Every structure is written in structure tokens, then in C-alpha cells.
Structure 1
Amino acid sequence: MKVEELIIDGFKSYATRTVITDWDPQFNAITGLNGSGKSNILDAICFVLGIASMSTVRASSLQDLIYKRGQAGVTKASVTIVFDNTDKSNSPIGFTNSPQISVTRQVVLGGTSKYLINGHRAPQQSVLQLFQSVQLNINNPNFLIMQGKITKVLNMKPSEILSLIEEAAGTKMFEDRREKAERTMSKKETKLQENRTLLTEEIEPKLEKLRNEKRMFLEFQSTQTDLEKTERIVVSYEYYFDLVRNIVKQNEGIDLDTYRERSKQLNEKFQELRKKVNPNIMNMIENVEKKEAALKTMIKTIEKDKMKIQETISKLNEYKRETLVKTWEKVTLDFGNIFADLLPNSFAKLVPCEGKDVTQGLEVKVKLGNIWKESLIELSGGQRSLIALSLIMALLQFRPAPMYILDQVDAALDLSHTQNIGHLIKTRFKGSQFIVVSLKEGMFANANRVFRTRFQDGTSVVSIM
């Protein structure tokens, strides 16, 4: 995904529609005076790729990214980026049949942002999954060194140095999804446990009361048949026009008073069981029996579902660990060789922490000569810049991300190492689009494309120098 056009509308120092074209796929270099808008170009690229923590875009809010906080006529802030797809090997999934991919993020005042791909709207998970497939994740980057953060890559905790190798291996998108999966499964597990204890306390007691009144309803239906036989015989015998004669000549000579008090003693049980049990309890108990059986089948399938998901993530963790070790060996070898080529008579390796495992975190260890540095706090800003640059280029040598953004990685390097970094990006590390902001001429004089940035009339312009 080589960037071909970048369209910035209403961003931090950009008040108009600025369209930057003529991007060379090998090495682009942004220059200009101080306060011109170079890091705002890189902040626009970070913003179109998606940020959560707005301190890396240098804002305290989202309306702080619009021009003059949106209170100067430009009430919207939209960033458009266009990617070329003549190389289908680094193309994302599903977008192979489109030679150009446009992504735009818009934010207006008051509300929050909204994304669109190729003109058509999309939520943030779609564009985040689009950019997390060519390892262009901004929320945990292995390609973005912002301004003043080149001498601080070696100050990182071992989980972050592990996460860079994890993003190179391809398993960081599995790791954050696995942690989200465990959290979501815990929340749905306590919800299902509340539902199970509600089923145990509130349903089956009422179900056995329903079974009790079911068997009393069979008794009441026996008395129902008793009424519609005996009371029919009774009202036939006091009615006495030929059918009543035919139903008299089967039971000739039934005693009147005993039949009358038997009718009364049947009707008193009837006026009791009329307010005892409802006459439609059989369809009701069939309905709630089907509901309880389907409910318990659902709970069993949910439990087997959780067991299958848990055993599958436990099986995937082993392949994650094996590809992490296989990535880490090649990356630390190329780390040592690139640091030996940049700074002569030196070496650097990535080592698992003392006593713990490789998948717990990694630490940089630096050799200058034949002595091992016990702590890397005693190194200069230029040496730490070279170790950080050699680590990022080792991650390039494993699996090259398409866009490497470097905001002033040469602020602590001398005039020899700056020209050597420019030469090694122009010659050796082909295979990625480099967007470097520099002020030292030895870096952007070895460039294939140079964009000057200037401040005029209240806005910023980008001129192809």
C-alpha cells in the first residue's frame, strides 16, 4: 500500500484543502522551517489511521484537531489518504479488485468522528481491521517514531519491546482479541451464572407447584365427568319428549332425595375447585415444560460453546509462542548485524528477562567493543537513536510494513550518521514507503521526493521542492 495522494481538510495547521501528490514509493522526505506543519502532516496520517490516546497527536480533545479549534470558519476536519494497489501481495483482504483505496476520517464540532472508505461510510472497526492487516496499527506501532521519541525507545518497558516483535510476528491482533475475549467471556459468564441461579430459585419451584395443580386438575376433571353424567341424569329425571323416556328406561327408579343431596355435594366441591385450579392448566404445563426443556438445552449448548472456545484459544497459544520464538531469533540476529553495520565495533541483542520467559518481555543489551553494557542508561542520545533505528530496520528485514513514519530521528545523530541513514534508506532498506521529517540536509538530500512545508497567511502549504 504505497501512498499516492494525501488530502487534508481543516486539520490543525491546515485550513484549506491541501492535496499532496507525487509520493515516491521508496523515500519521501518532509522539510521546512520551525512551526511550518510537518508534524501536523504526520499527525494527519496518524489521525486517518486511527488514534485513541490523543497525546500522540498532541491534543486534549477531538475538536482541538480542527483549524483554530473549529472557531475560525472551518468547522470540519477531514483527512483523506489514497493508497495504490499495483502490488497485490501487500493488499488487504477483499480489496484486491480495486486499484486505489481511499480512507477518510471526518470530525465536526460537538460530536465524534466517522470513517469512509472509497466514498462509502464505514465504522471504526472496519478501517481498524483494514489497517491492522498490513500491520499499520497506530495504537501499538512498530513503524512510528514521533518527534522527540527516538532517544526514548530504549526506555520502554519489556512488554512494549515484546509487542514490537509480536506485531512483526503477526500475533498482536490475536493477543488483544484474546484478552478482549477473556473479559467478554467473564462478563457473560457472570450474567449466565445469575441466570442459572434465577432458573434454580424461581422456575422449578413454580414448575412443581404447576405439576401439583396438574394432578389436582385430573381429579377435578374426574369430578367434571361426574357432574356431566350425574347432574344430567338428575335434570332428566326431574324434567319428567321421547328422548327423556329413553334415558329414563335405563335407570328406572332412582331415589330423588339422595340424588339431590349428591348433586349438592358435587356442586360444593365444584365451587371449591373452580377457585382452586384453572381449567386450562394442561396446555399451560405443556408450554412451560417445552420452555424449560429448550432453556436447559440452550444452557448446555452455551457451556459446551465456552468449553470449545477456551480449548481453542489454549491450542492457539502454543502456535503463537512458537512463531514468537521463531520471529525473535531472526529479528535479534538482524538487529545485531544492522547495529554492527551502522555503528562499527558494536553489537546488540534482544534477550528474555532474567529468569522469566521470552513471552514475558524482552530487553535490549548493547556491546561496544568486547564489553557488555549492564545498563543502557549510560549511552548517548545518538547511540540510543542508532539502536532504536536498527531495531526498527530489523523489524523491516523480518516483514516490511508499507509505511515507516520517522519524525526527526536524526536530531541526536552527527553529520556522518545522518548521511549514512539517508544512504541506507535509499540503497539498502528498499521495500517500504518512508515518510521522514528532517531539518538536517544530509538526510533529505539523499531523498527521492522532498516536500517543503511553509506557513503563509494563517495556513500551511506543502510545496513539492
Structure 2
Amino acid sequence: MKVEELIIDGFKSYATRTVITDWDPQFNAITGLNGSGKSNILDAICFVLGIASMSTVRASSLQDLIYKRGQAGVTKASVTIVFDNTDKSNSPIGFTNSPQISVTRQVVLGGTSKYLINGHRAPQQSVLQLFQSVQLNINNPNFLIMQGKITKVLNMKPSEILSLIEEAAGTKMFEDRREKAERTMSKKETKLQENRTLLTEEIEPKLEKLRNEKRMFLEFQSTQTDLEKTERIVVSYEYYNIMEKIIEDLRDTYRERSKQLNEKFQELRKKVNPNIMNMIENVEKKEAALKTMIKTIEKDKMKIQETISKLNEYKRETLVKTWEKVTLDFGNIFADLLPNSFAKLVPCEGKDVTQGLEVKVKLGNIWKESLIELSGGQRSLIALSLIMALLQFRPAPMYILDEVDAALDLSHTQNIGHLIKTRFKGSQFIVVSLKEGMFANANRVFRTRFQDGTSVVXXXXXXXX
């Protein structure tokens, strides 16, 4: 994406249509004394993006962003943004048909905001997903239109700001908080797990007694069958040895006594339970539930230690990786921007990378420890260098820098422009200078000035026996 066209009309300052073209695809410098006229562009852009978290952008009503609060003839504000979408990779899914994204933001009296994406309405969730597809969040160093006021906070800073800058690419505190919340949730669910185990332990004796009763009934049935077989064998023997009508219809005192005892036991141990199939089905279902519960318990028990080990390993690996990469990058940038110098990241006093690291700088040939020994211009320069080295973690096809050059020097601005033209190739950079008289090596210097209120550039017995 290359910003080569800008159309701003119907705003607090851009009341007339000003010809704004001839943009350089390598370096863009919009300078001049018209600070409000230049800031109105970023105001309109952030109003299109819906950002309302700035002391100069946040208003009580949406009518304030219109020309003279929409009470001086211009009762509506309509802007049109044309973003080049030749890069199909960075483009969102399902929107690669349009070669150029056209966003028409129109607001009228009343406070209603319009949404247009290539000629179609879109809710806030759709545009939020479209922004996330191009790496545009709310709590991230992205949304290049404005990064905040980190440059002023960068002055008189402890190692905490540097550690958070490193964690912006590291992102370890969020993981720690999420894992603490998950551990608390698991410790709370342990009570429900214990309740489930107690319920299963209370259910078990019922099925145990059911199995015992089923076994007793089976034993009684087997004894009754044995007694019946013995009685049938005795009747067959008596019939073969031999009033025969009763003997035909029916078909050793110890055997008779045993048969009577077995019959009495079967009569006294009936235990009628025709649902033995349902009982064994409930038993196997309980067994499956118990084995799945124990398998889940052991799974989470292993997962806890596995996640702990992975946390430690990833933490150490990312720590050494950043301590190498960002240190080398900062050293190279400090050597390229400031000639004959070298700044590095060193622990405070015999500390580790986990505790914190401070920046050791070199003014000429004199190693300086803290930033208090440096002038305000050098502090602003190192802040600009740090905010330029930080944006490489979240790359974007374009970038817009807004009023961070407080007291830069001439040769330092020349070196910055040379590094941007040489090292920062492939990125469309726009910069709005706060103080003039700098950046004399820019290929295109947009001299924006305030003018007309706008900006211009028997057989049985035998068988038995």
C-alpha cells in the first residue's frame, strides 16, 4: 500500500478543494508552519477510523468535528479515502476484487455516522475484523496514524519502559495473567471434581449390592435346576424299575434331603430382578464414566507440568533471542544514525535480563550511562530512534509520523533521511515536522501553509445313568 493520493474536502480547515498530488513513493515530508491545518488530516483519518481516545479528538458530540461545529453553512462533512490495494497478501479475505479500497465517510446533523466499504455498509465488528486482518488493534503500537506521547515519557525513564518495550514483542505478562486465571479456575473446579468422585463412590455400593443379588439369584437358580434334574432322574429310575398314571404325569434319603434343601434355598432366595440387562448396562456405563474421569484427571495432571516446562523453555528461548536481536538492531541503528557512537543494552548492576536492562550510550568517544548527561536534542533523537526501531516488530505497508522532532539537528536529520531512504526501503513514510529548518535531504518537501483558512502547498433312566 502506497499513499499517493489525498482528497480532503469539507472539514474544519479544508473548506476548499486544494490540489494535493505529486507524492514521492520513497519519502514524504509534509512540513510548514500550519500545524492545525496539517493536524486536521490526522483528525479526519482518526474520525474515519473511529478513534475517540485523544484529548484533542474526543468531544462531547460528533458534531464538533464538522466545520465550525456544523453551524456556519457547512452542516455536513464528507471525506473520501483511496487506499491502494495492489498487495493481495496484506488485503483481507473476500475483498481482493477491488484494486483500490474506497472509504467514503459522511456525517450530517444529528450525530449519525455512515460506514462505506467499496460501496457497502458495514457494522463495527466487520470493520474491526478488517482492521485486525491488517494488524490494526487498540492496545498495540499499531494504528500508525498516532502512537501516543511515548517520546516525552521516554525522557527520565527507568528500565521498566525498556522491559515493557521488549515485552511488546515478548508478550509474557499477558500469558502469566491468563495462566494464573486458568489455575484459579482449575482450583475452583477441583471442588466439583471431588463432588463428582464422592457421588460416584456413593453410587458404587448400590451396583455392588445389585451384582451380589444377581449372583445369589443365579446360584439359587443353578441349585434349583440341579435339584430338578436329580428329581427327574429319580422319577425316571422309579418308572424304569416299575398307579403308573401319576408316575407318567409327573415325568437314597440323602439325595431327597439335598433336593428339598436346594428347593427351600431357591424359594427363600428368589430375588426377582428381570432387569439384569439394564443393570449390567448401567454398570458398564458407570465404568466408562469412571475411566473417562480418571483419564481426564491424569490428562490435566500431565498438562499442568507440561505447560510449566513449556513456559520455562519458551521464556528462556525468547529471552535469549530478544537479548541478541534487539540489542544488535539497536547497536546498528545507533551506529548508523549517530556517527562514531555505540549504544547497547546492559543490566543495571550485575542483574539478569529478567530483572531489567538499561541503555548505555556513547557521546562521541565518551561512554555515557544515563540520559541526563545528554541535551534535550539528543534525548529527542534517541527517542525517535527507539520509536523507529520499535515499529519493525509490527510492520505496515505505510507509516505516518506526527510531531515528534522537538530539537533535532541538521546533520542528524540528514542522516535520518539517508537511513530512511536506504535502510527503510519498501515502506511508504510520511513525516510531519514540528520545527522547521530541518530535513534538508528530503526528496519531496511538502511546504504546507495556512491560507484562506485552509492548507495550500424307561429310556430316560438309561440316558441319565
Distance 1:277 1:186, change over 3 A: same
Is residue 337–residue 419 contact of structure 2 (8 Å, CA) maintained in 1?
no
1:439 deviates by 6.5
Which one has a bigger Cα radius of gyration? Answer: 2
Moved more, 178-187 or 414-423: 178-187
Is residue 156–residue 371 contact of structure 2 (8 Å, CA) maintained in 1?
no
1:34 deviates by 3.3
CA distance in 1, matches of 2:45, 2:144: 11
Is residue 37–residue 460 contact of structure 1 (8 Å, CA) maintained in 2?
yes
CA distance in 2, matches of 1:65, 1:247: 123
Is residue 153–residue 388 contact of structure 1 (8 Å, CA) maintained in 2?
no
Distance 1:256 1:335, change over 3 A: closer
Corresponding pairs, count? 460
1:61-112 C-alpha deviation (Å, 9 max, x unpaired)? 6433222222223333444322213333444444444321234545445536
Distance 1:230 1:342, change over 3 A: same
CA distance in 1, matches of 2:222, 2:111: 70
CA distance in 2, matches of 1:247, 1:33: 138
Distance 1:353 1:251, change over 3 A: farther
Moved more, 357-366 or 199-208: 199-208
1:301-350 C-alpha deviation (Å, 9 max, x unpaired)? 99999999999999799768855763453223211211122223433334
Would you say 1:344 and 2:335 are equivalent positions? no
1:183 deviates by 15
CA distance in 1, matches of 2:243, 2:6: 104
Distance 1:138 1:127, change over 3 A: same
Moved more, 4-13 or 169-178: 169-178
Distance 1:223 1:333, change over 3 A: same
Distance 1:77 1:258, change over 3 A: farther
TM-score, length of structure 1 as denominator length: 0.59
CA distance in 1, matches of 2:348, 2:259: 93
Would you say 1:427 and 2:422 are equivalent positions? yes
Is residue 403–residue 433 contact of structure 1 (8 Å, CA) maintained in 2?
yes
Distance 1:39 1:48, change over 3 A: same
Distance 1:70 1:181, change over 3 A: farther
1:412 deviates by 0.3
CA distance in 2, matches of 1:194, 1:19: 74
Moved more, 126-135 or 169-178: 169-178
1:4 deviates by 3.4
Distance 1:423 1:284, change over 3 A: same
Distance 1:450 1:414, change over 3 A: closer
Moved more, 435-444 or 347-356: 347-356
Aligned to 2:330: 335
Moved more, 311-320 or 325-334: 311-320
Give the secondary-structure state (helix, strand or coil) at the position aligned to 2:15: coil
Distance 1:307 1:343, change over 3 A: same
Is residue 224–residue 262 contact of structure 2 (8 Å, CA) maintained in 1?
no
Identify, as 1 or 2, the structure richer in strand.
1
Is residue 30–residue 433 contact of structure 2 (8 Å, CA) maintained in 1?
yes
1:155 deviates by 3.4
Distance 1:13 1:371, change over 3 A: same
Is residue 92–residue 134 contact of structure 1 (8 Å, CA) maintained in 2?
yes
CA distance in 2, matches of 1:458, 1:233: 125
Is residue 32–residue 448 contact of structure 2 (8 Å, CA) maintained in 1?
yes
Is residue 6–residue 82 contact of structure 1 (8 Å, CA) maintained in 2?
yes
Is residue 150–residue 385 contact of structure 1 (8 Å, CA) maintained in 2?
no
1:334-367 C-alpha deviation (Å, 9 max, x unpaired)? 1121112222343333467789986787654434
CA distance in 2, matches of 1:21, 1:232: 116
1:352-402 C-alpha deviation (Å, 9 max, x unpaired)? 778998678765443436765443244222211221222233235556432
Give the secondary-structure state (helix, strand or coil) at the position aligned to 1:17: coil
Is residue 224–residue 263 contact of structure 2 (8 Å, CA) maintained in 1?
no
Is residue 107–residue 113 contact of structure 2 (8 Å, CA) maintained in 1?
yes
Is residue 348–residue 365 contact of structure 1 (8 Å, CA) maintained in 2?
yes
Is residue 66–residue 75 contact of structure 1 (8 Å, CA) maintained in 2?
yes
1:195 deviates by 17
1:9 deviates by 4.1
Give the secondary-structure state (helix, strand or coil) at the position aligned to 2:133: coil
Moved more, 302-311 or 261-270: 261-270
Give the secondary-structure state (helix, strand or coil) at the position aligned to 2:96: coil
1:227 deviates by 45
CA distance in 1, matches of 2:327, 2:364: 18
Distance 1:157 1:376, change over 3 A: closer
Is residue 92–residue 133 contact of structure 1 (8 Å, CA) maintained in 2?
yes
Moved more, 320-329 or 25-34: 320-329
Moved more, 367-376 or 284-293: 284-293
Distance 1:84 1:449, change over 3 A: farther
Q: How does 1:62-81 map to 2 (within 5 A)?
A: 62-81=62-81
CA distance in 1, matches of 2:173, 2:97: 25
Aligned to 2:131: 131
CA distance in 2, matches of 1:260, 1:464: 15
Moved more, 347-356 or 399-408: 347-356
TM-score, length of structure 2 as denominator length: 0.59
CA distance in 2, matches of 1:340, 1:299: 60
CA distance in 2, matches of 1:459, 1:272: 110
1:413 deviates by 1.2
Is residue 163–residue 172 contact of structure 1 (8 Å, CA) maintained in 2?
no
1:409-460 C-alpha deviation (Å, 9 max, x unpaired)? 4430122212222222223321211111126676555334443333333334
Say which of 389, 393, 398 aligns to 1:394.
Answer: 389
Moved more, 173-182 or 144-153: 173-182
Distance 1:193 1:114, change over 3 A: farther
Is residue 336–residue 348 contact of structure 1 (8 Å, CA) maintained in 2?
yes
Moved more, 371-380 or 156-165: 156-165
Give the secondary-structure state (helix, strand or coil) at the position aligned to 2:273: coil
Moved more, 279-288 or 247-256: 247-256
Give the secondary-structure state (helix, strand or coil) at the position aligned to 2:3: strand
CA distance in 1, matches of 2:113, 2:421: 37
Is residue 61–residue 111 contact of structure 2 (8 Å, CA) maintained in 1?
no
CA distance in 2, matches of 1:140, 1:217: 73
Give the secondary-structure state (helix, strand or coil) at the position aligned to 1:20: coil
CA distance in 1, matches of 2:23, 2:401: 16
CA distance in 1, matches of 2:213, 2:356: 65
Is residue 6–residue 21 contact of structure 1 (8 Å, CA) maintained in 2?
yes
Moved more, 156-165 or 257-266: 257-266
Distance 1:285 1:53, change over 3 A: farther
Is residue 48–residue 80 contact of structure 1 (8 Å, CA) maintained in 2?
no
Distance 1:34 1:213, change over 3 A: farther
